Design a protein around this ligand. Structure first.
Ligand SMILES: Nc1nc2c(ncn2[C@@H]2O[C@H](COP(=O)(O)OP(=O)(O)O)[C@@H](O)[C@H]2O)c(=O)[nH]1
Ligand SMILES: [Mg+2]
Lengths: 170, 279
């Protein structure tokens, strides 16, 4: 059925846009439904890449601590993890430190990571400058993108970047 | 080995249902399960009823140790700035009763199988459980989360499309529920009769405190009060107020509550039909 199978993880604070990002990738829709994800949810998307057919098993996680033990199972065995923050939410940016630690703790040592600043359409409410995020990401050898789930900006590129990077790790 | 069939009982409560299922899955030789006849919407109502019974029991016995003379829950220590604006459709109200917060942060939406967001208390809640990991609150939330996970694992298994799959995670979710129920039922057993107040969802809010609220805070209160079967003194106080109603109206006519799922159009209608009633 496929040449490859990449388990992907979406992690990051509650309400920063993880479920929205995953909905823009899988179905190209956007909705404002105030519904919090419980534990985990997943989607499946087969993509063709450099001639090879790749299955993406993408896991949407919950960001709140009571669900931490439930999501942690999925860090091991993950080929790539996307750490998401909200560009209008300094706290959720600060917490990326704490998320990178959960990746250490539970994920393999070779996982591909991606930093992603969401809600970048809120331009007058942005409190996390691109440079401060970029510099942090660069210090780690970690790619970084500013996405908008709402206006479909870089959402495709984030998952396709990450699939490309994992494929390159062969 | 024959995989057992999870079935939902004639009117049996969530705990009995789980006890039943854990028994069927603990039987010898079983290595899969049939979740085909499980109605996830009914499973959610079933868990929500139980949560409601627990949250009600916590309030009656005042497991929160709330002093009569405070108008605030015990989360206040873990939250400023205390923005008065809406956060994913709710505004922080310091006057929320603990059992309402508990219900909010743990009720499974029968339609979507997620939680209807209650963002202003997610961080104070988490912060509380960190300083007080053995607190009654932490135990209730833990039983709550445990019940959610049972439904989660079943919905996962009920799907199909994956590697394999596979069960021990379900088995554990069931046993973790039982355990946490033991501790919850034990807390509850210790028994000062029940103390009542003069609105359903919030501790008493005085006129001066209430005239300091933003429109978003006020609308949050109104939307909450409509969950009650009878008009409240609090919501009447707000709608009766001309000045307060102004703030309520231009928040209702905002965008901060667009995404709400608690029948937001219909509630907005009730609120308007109630202002007219009252002026
Ligand atoms: N302006 C803007 N708001 C967003 C964006 N993505 C998500 N949101 C908002 O934040 C909420 C979605 O976050 P969500 O993914 O559902 O929560 P999570 O699963 O816990 O990350 C929505 O209800 C939106 O109001 C975005 O790209 N732009
Ligand atoms: Mg989520």
């Amino acid at each position: 059925e496929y040449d490859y199978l990449f388990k992907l993880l979406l992690i990051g604070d509650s309400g920063v846009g993880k479920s929205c990002l995953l909905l823009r990738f899988a179905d190209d829709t956007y909705t404002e439904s105030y519904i919090s994800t419980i534990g985990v949810d997943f989607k499946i998307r087969t993509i063709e890449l450099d001639g090879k057919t790749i299955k993406l098993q993408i896991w949407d996680t919950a960001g709140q601590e009571r669900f931490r033990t439930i999501t942690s199972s999925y860090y091991r065995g993950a080929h790539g993890i996307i750490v998401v923050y909200d560009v209008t939410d300094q706290e959720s940016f600060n917490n990326v430190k704490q998320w990178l630690q959960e990746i250490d703790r539970y994920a393999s040592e070779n996982v591909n990571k991606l930093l992603v600043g969401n809600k970048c359409d809120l331009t007058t409410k942005k409190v996390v400058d691109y440079t401060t995020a970029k510099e942090f990401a660069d210090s780690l050898g970690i790619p970084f993108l500013e996405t908008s789930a709402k206006n479909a900006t870089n959402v495709e590129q984030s998952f396709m970047t990450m699939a490309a990077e994992i494929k390159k790790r062969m | 080995a024959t995989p057992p069939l999870l079935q939902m009982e004639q009117e049996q409560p969530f705990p009995e249902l789980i006890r039943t299922w854990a028994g069927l899955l603990g039987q010898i030789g079983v290595e899969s399960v049939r979740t085909e006849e499980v109605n996830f919407g009914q499973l959610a109502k079933c868990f929500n009823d139980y949560l409601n019974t627990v949250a009600e029991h916590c309030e009656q016995q005042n497991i929160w140790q709330h002093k009569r003379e405070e108008n605030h829950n015990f989360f206040t220590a873990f939250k400023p700035d205390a923005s008065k604006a809406a956060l994913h459709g709710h505004a922080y109200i310091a006057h929320y009763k603990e059992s309402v917060i508990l219900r909010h942060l743990s009720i499974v939406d029968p339609k979507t199988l997620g939680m209807l967001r209650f963002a202003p208390y997610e961080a104070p809640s988490t912060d509380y459980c960190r300083h007080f990991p053995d607190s009654p609150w932490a135990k209730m939330q833990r039983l709550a989360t445990a019940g959610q996970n049972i439904i989660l694992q079943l919905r996962l298994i009920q799907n199909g499309q994956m590697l394999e799959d596979d069960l021990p995670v379900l088995q554990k979710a069931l046993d973790d529920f039982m355990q946490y129920k033991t501790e919850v039922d034990a807390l509850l057993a210790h028994d000062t009769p029940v103390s009542t107040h003069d609105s359903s969802f919030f501790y008493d809010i005085d006129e001066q405190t209430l005239n300091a609220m933003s429109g978003d805070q006020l609308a949050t209160i109104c939307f909450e009060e409509l969950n009650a079967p009878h008009p409240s003194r609090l919501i009447m106080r707000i709608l009766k107020s001309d000045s307060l109603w102004q703030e309520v109206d231009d928040s209702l006519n905002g965008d901060a509550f667009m995404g709400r799922q608690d029948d937001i159009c219909e509630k907005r209608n009730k609120i308007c039909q109630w202002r007219q009633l009252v002026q």
